[PDB]
A paper describes a structure:
The crystal structure of EaEst2 has been determined at a 1.74 Å resolution in the ligand-free form. The structure was refined to an Rwork of 19.6% and an Rfree of 21.3%. The asymmetric unit of the crystal (space group P212121) contained one EaEst2 molecule and 169 water molecules. The overall structure of EaEst2 comprised seven β-strands and 10 α-helices and adopted a classical α/β hydrolase fold in the core domain, which was a twisted β sheet surrounded by α-helices and a cap domain. Three putative catalytic residues, S93, D190, and H220, were located on the β4-α4, β6-α8, and β7-α9 loops, respectively. Notably, the substrate binding pocket of EaEst2 was covered by a cap domain comprising α2-, α5-, and α6-helices, forming a long and narrow shape. Additionally, our sequence analysis revealed that EaEst2 possesses a conserved pentapeptide, GLSLG, in its amino acid sequence from 91–95, including a catalytic Ser residue, which is a typical consensus motif in carboxylesterase Family XIII enzymes. Unlike most carboxylesterases, which are thought to exist as dimers in solution, the functional unit of EaEst2 was determined to be a monomer by size-exclusion chromatography. Collectively, the EaEst2 enzyme can degrade BHET into MHET by cleavage of the ester bond and cannot utilize MHET as a substrate. As a result, we investigated the possible interaction mode between EaEst2 and BHET using computational docking simulations.
Numbering used by the authors: 3 to 246
The structure:
């Protein structure tokens, strides 16, 4: 199985930190990164600990690890000399983008299909087992091989910390001052889509907008309205107060 690695795509002086989703990878934001590169923007996509790896590694990690990966990616951009950084993320990546805007200076925040409601731990964990099965099926494992491995698959007690991160972020949205573009797929079966209104309504940012994508599902970057999303993000980024 060929695992996605992190990326850094050079464009101009203007930088965007691209954050993937829970069980996702840099693959979730690679086409957006390429689009941005072609239009003047530099991007860097980190990957979270336990992701782009066998699923048994994922259950040994938690949001304390993933949050440090976000900060490490932000810091890598500033270490390369990019002092103006917008932050854009998919699902959990959108939550990490909002949290990052509360902790570090960012030019803008673009949460895409970010969850702002709290699902039961067993529903979250069921998403991790679906993920593990689909990984093992991409490994060409037999249905017996997959069932044997899933029968010893360990719990993930850090999902309760992931619930806490969602709740803290929802409860602290007034702390977001940076210009905010909320992106939300209409046909999202993975989160409560009202989260888009919670986030849009909750941030203190004067400069904010909510765009609904009427023919897309949760993984909006990979779906049929990705082209429109790219242009919408591009126009938003171009209207920001960049030094040059």
């Amino acid at each position: 199985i060929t695992l996605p690695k992190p990326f850094f795509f050079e464009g101009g002086n203007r930088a965007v930190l691209l954050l993937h989703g829970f069980t996702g990878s840099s693959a979730d934001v690679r086409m957006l990164g390429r689009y941005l590169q072609k239009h003047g923007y530099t991007s860097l996509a980190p990957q979270y600990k336990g992701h782009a790896a066998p699923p048994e590694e994922l259950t040994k990690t938690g949001p304390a690890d993933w949050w440090q990966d976000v900060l490490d990616g932000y810091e890598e951009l500033k270490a390369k000399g990019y002092d103006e950084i917008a932050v854009c993320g998919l699902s959990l990546g959108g939550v990490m983008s909002l949290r990052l805007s509360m902790h570090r200076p960012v030019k803008a925040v673009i949460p895409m299909c970010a969850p702002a409601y709290i699902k039961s731990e067993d529903v979250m964990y069921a998403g991790v087992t679906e993920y593990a099965r689909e990984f093992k099926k991409r490994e060409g494992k037999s249905v017996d091989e997959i069932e044997q491995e899933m029968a010893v698959f360990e719990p993930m007690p850090t999902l309760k910390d992931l619930q806490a991160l969602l709740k803290e972020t929802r409860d602290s949205l007034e702390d977001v001052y940076a210009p905010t573009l909320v992106v939300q797929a209409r046909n999202d079966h993975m989160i409560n889509t009202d989260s888009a209104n919670i986030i849009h309504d909750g941030v203190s940012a004067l400069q904010k907008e909510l765009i609904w994508y009427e023919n897309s599902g949760h993984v909006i970057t990979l779906d049929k309205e990705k082209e429109t999303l790219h242009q919408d993000i591009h126009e938003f980024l171009d209207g920001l107060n960049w030094s040059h």
